[PDB]
Design a protein around this ligand. Sequence first.
Ligand SMILES: [Zn+2]
Lengths: 249, 49, 55, 123, 73, 18
Amino acid sequence: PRVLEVYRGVREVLSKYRSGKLPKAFKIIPALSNWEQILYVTEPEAWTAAAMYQATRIFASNLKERMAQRFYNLVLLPRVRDDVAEYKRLNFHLYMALKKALFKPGAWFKGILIPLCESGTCTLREAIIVGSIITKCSIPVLHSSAAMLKIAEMEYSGANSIFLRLLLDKKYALPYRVLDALVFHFLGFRTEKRELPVLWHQCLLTLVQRYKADLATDQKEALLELLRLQPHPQLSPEIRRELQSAVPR
Amino acid sequence: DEEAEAKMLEKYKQERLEEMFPDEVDTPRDVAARIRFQKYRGLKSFRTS
Amino acid sequence: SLARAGKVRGQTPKVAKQEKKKKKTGRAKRRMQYNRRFVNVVPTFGKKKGPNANS
Amino acid sequence: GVMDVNTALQEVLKTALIHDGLARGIREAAKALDKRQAHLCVLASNCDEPMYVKLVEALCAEHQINLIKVDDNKKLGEWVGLCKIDREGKPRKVVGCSCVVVKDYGKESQAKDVIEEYFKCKK
Amino acid sequence: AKKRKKKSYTTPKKNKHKRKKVKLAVLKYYKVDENGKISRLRRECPSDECGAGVFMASHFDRHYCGKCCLTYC
Amino acid sequence: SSVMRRNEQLTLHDERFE
Ligand SMILES: [Zn+2]
């Protein structure tokens, strides 16, 4: 009816949005019930990066974490993956969109990071960009630990070690189940005949720099065995040195 | 007493800066360069000009 | 005209020598030279690498 | 009558962090109390503003909400867990809470009995 | 290779605008008599979701809701 | 859930995984 043509009009507005105030019908989108229909009327695939930054701003600011999760999984993350794949870098507006999406961390981890990791096709540039984005944002310890348990339990991809390492650089107090999952993942790399890159070695090195004081002696010797079986000419002496000069408790 | 020591440290950093870069001077943006370097000219060659 | 003296030597920045562990001398140095060239030999298909070969 | 009130209260607080059942501070502890989804109220005796304490007392006495009084707000902030910890577990951020409101309980058989006995002794 | 000099240049950006700090904003919401009766100075929001907790910004002529933007006269 | 466990030294928070 009359609502449909107004939302076609604001669809035409959002396809060319650069700056300024948006219509007030756009800002009351989360307060409505049938949001998916009017959102598909607004055609988010044809949005401008500034318009999607404002949409992420609005949707993150208005509570209801499940709906923010659905918006991040359905609209924001495909746009990010399409922009990295074609432009080989992330836009300024979309970068601040992902930061304002990390304003809501619970919908972010379960909507942006974990679906990207379980998609399997996550490239290295996407890993670097998203890891820098989680590096900039201060993250709650519970959400970071749950995401680290998630990424530890998953099947390995080369992009996963960057996320794991940049989560270990946060230097938070770690739950001991999380460290058990990390050690079990690395000891799951014990019998792999695949050549592992320097990224995996750097993730292990980071785990030994920051959490060597909270490692049991049995898993310490297991990590020494791990270094023995899967060596590197450069990093493995340093990981061995850091494991040798560690005090527990 | 410490003013002389501060002068010695800025002398040290000036000597270090003038060894890495021979006669490099930053142009001031508050006054014009043609006024602050009013007495300066350019030589095509330091040998023949 | 021209004829500077000690131009480049006075121009080059002074880099101090790093403090390193001393070298062995005499029979020990010859022992280390022998154990490096004839004992722990790594097989090579064509042997195109020198002792000071870098990159 | 086995363990004291000052361990049962922190057990109730721990179950509340587990079940996400604390309105802490000044205004979440007030607005969630006024929505009557809340159960218990805790006030720090060490205070700078007296009619704030009077307002909390009036909010408690409006609908028979029980009031608990603790001495210092920094001790209550340590009790709640508003302190950032290191790898060893050493607190480095000292933030004190004044009004702590328990909305949801954990199903306890020891601390709940102790606080119920203390409440039946109080009123 | 050939490095650069890194021209410094001083530009004072210390002065930045921030919003004013309001201290103890809860005290003006309620007025309590000496007996202990609570009087609500500010209008309660009769909205769908934010009821019984959200007050009104009291304008010179009207009231404003701070979560769903409800306007009165 | 793994088999090699924390052994000793304190439990600060229980963590919510569910
Ligand atoms: Zn509002």
